[PDB]
Amino acid sequence: KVAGITQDFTDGTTTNTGRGLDVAISQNGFFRLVDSNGSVFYSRNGQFKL
Amino acid sequence: ATAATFSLSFLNSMQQNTGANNIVATNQNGYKPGDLVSYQINNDGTVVGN
Numbered sequence: 834k835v836a837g838i839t840q841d842f843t844d845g846t847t848t849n850t851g852r853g854l855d856v857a858i859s860q861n862g863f864f865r866l867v868d869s870n871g872s873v874f875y876s877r878n879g880q881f882k883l
Numbered sequence: 884a885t886a887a888t889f890s891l892s893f894l895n896s897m898q899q900n901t902g903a904n905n906i907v908a909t910n911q912n913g914y915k916p917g918d919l920v921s922y923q924i925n926n927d928g929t930v931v932g933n
Contacts, residue, residue, distance in 0.1 A: 870920060872920060
C-alpha cells in the first residue's frame with residue numbers, strides 16, 4: 834500500500850532576481866494565499882505580480 | 884445587525900519575563916457564511932464537508 838507521497842522541506846538555493854516583487858522565504862514559514870472562492874492556501878512560490 | 888455579547892478568556896496567559904509582549908493563541912467560535920467547496924471522508928470515518 835502506498836502510505837503517501839511525502840515531501841522534504843529543506844530549502845532550495847535562493848536565486849537572486851533583480852525584480853522587486855520576488856519575495857521568498859528561507860526557513861520554516863509559508864505564505865498564506867486566497868483566491869476568487871475564498872479558500873486558504875499555503876505556498877513557497879516567490880514570484881509575485883499585481 | 885444585533886451586537887455580539889460574549890465572554891473573552893485570558894486564561895493560561897503567563898508573564899514572560901524578558902522579551903517582547905507577544906500573543907500565542909487567539910481563537911473565537913464565531914464564523915462567516917461558508918457556502919460549499921468540497922467534502923471528504925477521513926481515516927476515522929468522519930464524513931466532513933469543507
